[PDB]
Structures are given as C-alpha cells and as structure tokens.
C-alpha cells in the first residue's frame, strides 16, 4: 500500500518541505522516494540539499456469482474478486449479456454471490444498455436504478482513451467500494487501432500496460476484472487466470468450456441467455 | 570499394620532399595513422557535442578536440592550419 509522505518528516525533513512535496502532488514516502531529486527540487522553496535529504531518508522508510449456478460450480462458486477472468468466445455468445448480468450480480450480497460493491462498465462497442441492467436487477431482485448508480460508465473510443479511463477508475474506485470492472470488446480497439504487422509489438505493449494497471487496481481494491475477447494474443495467457471458451448452442443456450486454469480442470458447462439474466441452461 | 588515404599522403609527400618515395609498408602505417587521428578527433568532438546537448559537430568542436588531444606546439600549429583552411574555404 501507500506510505504517506507524513512519515518523511520524522526522518528529519522539515515539515514545510513535506508540504511543498505534497503541493507537487507527491503524497507518500514511496512516491517521493522512487522519483529523482529534480522533481522535489523543482518545487518552489526547495533546494537540492533538502532534496538529497529527502531521497536518502525516504529510501530508509520505503467471490462474485456468475448467476449461472452450473457455471458457478464450474468456477467453484463464481468469479474470484481481485483477479482477472477472461471469457473468450464468438459474437452473439452473450458476452455483452454476461457483462450486463455481472454488472448487477456484483452488487448482490456476498452471501448471494455478489461482492457487495459497485460495478464498472467500460464500453468500447456501444452495446451498453441500462435497460438490460434493469432486467438483470429485477431478475436478482436488485434495484435497477441502484445498479446504474453502482455502475460508472464510459465508452472508450480508442486504446489511448481505453487506458485513460483507467486513470479515472483508479481515483474513483478509492472513493467508492467497487466489486466489478467490465471491459466489453476489450480487444477490439487493439485490432482497429493496431492493424499492422509491424504494430504487433505496439498493441502488445499497450495491452501489457493496460493489464498491469488492471492488476494493480485488482490488487488494490480486491475487485473482479472482467474483459471480453473475440478469438477469430499470447501475452494474455500469462495475464488471464481462467480462460473460458464460449460457443453458441442454437436458440439462446450457450456452451462454456474451460481452456485454462492452473488449478481448475478443463471442463464444460451449459448455460442459457434469458431475458432477465445470464442463467443456467434450462432445456 | 576499399578506401585509403594513400594518394593524398603521396601528394603531401611530394610537397615536402619532391624526390622522395615511400614503401608499401610505410604507406600502410601512414594510413593507419590518419585513420587513428581521425577517430580520436571525431570521437572527442562527438562527446563535446553530446556534453553540451548540441546535435551538430562544428569546426569549434573540432578545434577544442584538437586542443584536448594534441600536445603543445602540435596543437597550436594544427589549430592554425584548421582555422586558415576554414577561412580560405569560406570565401
């Protein structure tokens, strides 16, 4: 966690210099410490000697239910909060529907398979429907209005906007308790933006940074991170903890397969897409 | 192809000693010499430009590099020749 910069004054930095460091926007001893001298020196009323004293003394101090029961059993009860679970599958498999369902189930009591936290829906595809959220909320008997109140929503127009929303997510997730972060068509902007072959490393780098920010937020807030992937990157293998393959069974009933878990078996479960919900298959 | 300073060394030789020749081995040593001093001066000039956050190597960097690398009278005469050459060239 953080090591608030207050602790730096006990090292014998005078408090005025700490206030100037806070003015710069450095608020922890960790924050000042792993930065060079010039950042603290550039602050008004701070010399190089005080900065050397600061750096030297600073180094001294520094399960959400899927709502398909059969799928929950496949997952041993639902998504583990604090980790990334990847569901890769074809279009029309219900990925957007699953996102809408989870956006509400996260708000469920933990004893009901929720995280008792607010939800975060980052859309890149325009498919965000508050009315679908209302349907899922009424399914689980949650207030649809409260679902929208526990879902902060923003549509990312590009990869840069996609990463920029993470900055708002990190500061906003501190102020309110969240349990779910949704990124729908998470890989589409990496395909439309990064379309070249020479750009493979570029999309991989942007994705890597995006994933690292995701991991930091997951470890920071203990929330579930849900991203959706269409498989028509090898970087995701190390990053996803649980890989789910989704394929259509005709009508509204979908087949789920586990394609990676270091602990969980490779296995499959059948579920359906119902007006209210993403919910177990009911032949 | 494969470059050397041989013809220029020979022209200079003809300037200072009109009736004197030079062996193949000796010419090889002169070529080694010119390349060596080129590398020393160019390298120092490169560092001079870098230290001062300049992207251009100018005659001033060459001159300073010469002052750093050459001893005493060699340095003074070399500086004189470079300056003279640049002045003759400019007009």
């Amino acid at each position: 966690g953080p090591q608030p910069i207050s602790r730096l004054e006990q090292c014998g930095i005078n408090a005025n210099d700490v206030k100037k460091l806070e003015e710069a926007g450095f608020h922890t001893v960790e924050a000042v410490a792993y930065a060079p001298k010039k950042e603290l020196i550039n602050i008004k009323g701070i010399s190089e000697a005080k900065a050397d004293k600061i750096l030297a003394e600073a180094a001294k101090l520094v399960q959400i239910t899927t709502g398909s029961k059969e799928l929950d059993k496949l997952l041993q009860g639902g998504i583990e909060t604090g980790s990334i679970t990847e569901m890769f599958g074809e279009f029309r498999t219900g990925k957007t529907q699953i996102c809408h369902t989870l956006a509400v189930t996260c708000q469920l009591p933990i004893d009901r398979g929720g995280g008792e936290g607010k939800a975060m829906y980052i859309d890149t595809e325009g498919t965000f429907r508050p009315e679908r959220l209302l349907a899922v909320a009424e399914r689980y008997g949650l207030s649809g209005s409260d679902v929208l109140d526990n879902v902060a929503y923003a549509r990312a127009f590009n990869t840069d906007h996609q990463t920029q929303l993470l900055y708002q997510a990190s500061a906003m997730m501190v102020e309110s308790r969240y349990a779910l972060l949704i990124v729908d068509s998470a890989t589409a902007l990496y395909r439309t933006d990064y379309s070249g072959r020479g750009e493979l490393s570029a999309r991989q780098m942007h994705l890597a940074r995006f994933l690292r920010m995701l991991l930091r937020l997951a470890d920071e807030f203990g929330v579930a991170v849900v991203i959706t992937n269409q498989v028509v990157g090898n970087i995701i293998a190390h990053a996803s903890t649980t890989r789910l393959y989704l394929r259509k069974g005709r009508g509204e009933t979908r087949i789920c397969k586990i394609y990676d878990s270091p602990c969980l078996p490779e296995a499959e479960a059948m579920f359906a897409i119902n007006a209210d919900g993403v919910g177990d298959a009911k032949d | 192809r494969k470059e050397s300073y041989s013809i220029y060394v020979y022209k200079v030789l003809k300037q200072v000693h009109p009736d004197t020749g030079i062996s193949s081995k000796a010419m090889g040593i002169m070529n080694s010499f010119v390349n060596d001093i080129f590398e020393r001066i160019a390298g120092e000039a490169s560092r001079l430009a870098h230290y001062n956050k300049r992207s251009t190597i100018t005659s001033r960097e060459i001159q300073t590099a010469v002052r750093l690398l050459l001893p005493g009278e060699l340095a003074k005469h070399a500086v004189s020749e470079g300056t003279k050459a640049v002045t003759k060239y400019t007009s």
């Binding site: 780098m205 890597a208 | 490169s46 870098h50």
Partner: protein, 102 residues
Amino acid sequence: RSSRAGLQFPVGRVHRLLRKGNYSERVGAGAPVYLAAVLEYLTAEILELAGNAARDNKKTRIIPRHLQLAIRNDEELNKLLGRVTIAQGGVLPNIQAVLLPK
C-alpha cells in the same frame, strides 16, 4: 518492457539513451533489453559483495568503503574497474612483509 523482460532496470529509458547517444542509425528491439539486463546484473554483483562487506563491518548501510572493498577483493570486478577511482573508497589493508619487525 521491463516487466515483460522480467527486469528491474528501465528498458524504455535504456532504449531512449541508445537512440539519442548516436551509436547507430537503427536499434533492435532486443538490444535495450539485453543491455538493461547486463547493467542490472553487474549492479547486483557489486551490491551483493558490498552488502557482504558492510555486514562484516557490522554496518547496515553500504558506504563507498564497502564498494571499494567489494571491488578490489574480487579479481574480475577489480579487473573490470582497473582504471577507476572509487571516491572515499580508501585502499585494501596491505603491508609488505619485509617492512614488519623481525
């Protein structure tokens, strides 16, 4: 890229320094990774030995003296830094045998 390479030293920064140091017109993707890894390793070897010296001296903080002891007491580091001066390092204790009393 540092995380991708499993490193602590900054690959991006090393890449930038390679680009702006006028070493070559082009720089491969693996070059700054390799360089960063080497710099990190050597840093680790010197810090390992210097830490050892610091503890031998019952000190918890590494000072230049410990760096000098670490470097000069290690044949290969001593070789690598043969023409290098460590400020405030001092020298290894060493008295020629002929100078000692009989």
